[PDB]
Ligand binder design. Structure first.
Ligand SMILES: [Cl-]
Ligand SMILES: [Cl-]
Ligand SMILES: [Cl-]
Ligand SMILES: [Cl-]
Ligand SMILES: [Cl-]
Ligand SMILES: [Cl-]
Ligand SMILES: [Cl-]
Ligand SMILES: [Cl-]
Ligand SMILES: [Cl-]
Ligand SMILES: [Cl-]
Ligand SMILES: [Cl-]
Ligand SMILES: [Cl-]
Ligand SMILES: [Cl-]
Ligand SMILES: [Cl-]
Ligand SMILES: [Cl-]
Ligand SMILES: [Cl-]
Ligand SMILES: [Cl-]
Ligand code: NA
Ligand code: NA
Ligand code: NA
Ligand code: NA
Ligand code: NA
Ligand code: NA
Ligand code: NA
Length: 75
């Protein structure tokens, strides 16, 4: 089943940097990322609901690449 979020207020970023944050720094089990413009927003899907819930708790308020990130569930 699908456990998706949208990360917002990202400013400019690289996909390598973002996948590092999610998978190396925060140890999320990421199944998929759609951030095609490399700015402002990224959709992410996690293998478990636990990581989706974890991503929303952590990323809301998380200072990264000069920005205070926000995140919400995505359908
Ligand atoms: Cl920026
Ligand atoms: Cl932004
Ligand atoms: Cl960029
Ligand atoms: Cl990068
Ligand atoms: Cl990039
Ligand atoms: Cl990096
Ligand atoms: Cl990081
Ligand atoms: Cl985690
Ligand atoms: Cl992907
Ligand atoms: Cl799409
Ligand atoms: Cl992408
Ligand atoms: Cl592209
Ligand atoms: Cl689950
Ligand atoms: Cl988890
Ligand atoms: Cl919050
Ligand atoms: Cl924080
Ligand atoms: Cl800063
Ligand atoms: Na934004
Ligand atoms: Na980085
Ligand atoms: Na890792
Ligand atoms: Na693309
Ligand atoms: Na748009
Ligand atoms: Na922070
Ligand atoms: Na959405």
């Amino acid at each position: 089943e699908i456990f998706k979020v949208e990360v917002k207020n990202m400013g400019y970023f690289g996909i390598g940097e973002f996948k590092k944050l999610l998978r190396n720094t925060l140890k999320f089990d990421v199944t998929k990322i759609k951030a095609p413009t490399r700015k402002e927003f990224a959709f992410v899907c996690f293998r478990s609901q636990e990581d989706q819930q974890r991503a929303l708790e952590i990323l809301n308020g998380y200072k990264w690449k000069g920005k205070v990130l926000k995140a919400h569930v995505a359908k």
